[PDB]
């Protein structure tokens, strides 16, 4: 797999809430890649994380 293990402090606080899966999906898509930039091949997951968290400031 190569997964994150989501108990890690403050990363776990983004891997949570309404948009937690957008963090799971974005940061796993990046960690599976390691090309050059955070999600250079994955931008739709990080875009969904913006598109989700732009609804929710401090809600979770």
């Amino acid at each position: 797999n190569g997964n994150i293990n989501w108990n890690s402090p403050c990363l776990g606080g983004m891997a949570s809430g309404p948009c937690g899966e957008q963090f799971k999906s974005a940061f796993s898509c990046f960690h599976y890649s390691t090309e050059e930039i955070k999600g250079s091949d994955c931008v739709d997951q990080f875009r969904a994380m913006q598109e989700c968290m732009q609804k929710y400031p401090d809600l979770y």
Binding site: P9, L11, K38, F46, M49, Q50
Partner: peptide, 21 residues
């Protein structure tokens, strides 16, 4: 240890992509 050693890069990369895409 402190909380979130990659967390500014989490927030600021999703902001930078929030401007770029």
């Amino acid at each position: 240890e402190h909380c979130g050693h990659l967390i500014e890069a989490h927030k600021e990369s999703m902001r930078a992509l929030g401007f770029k895409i």
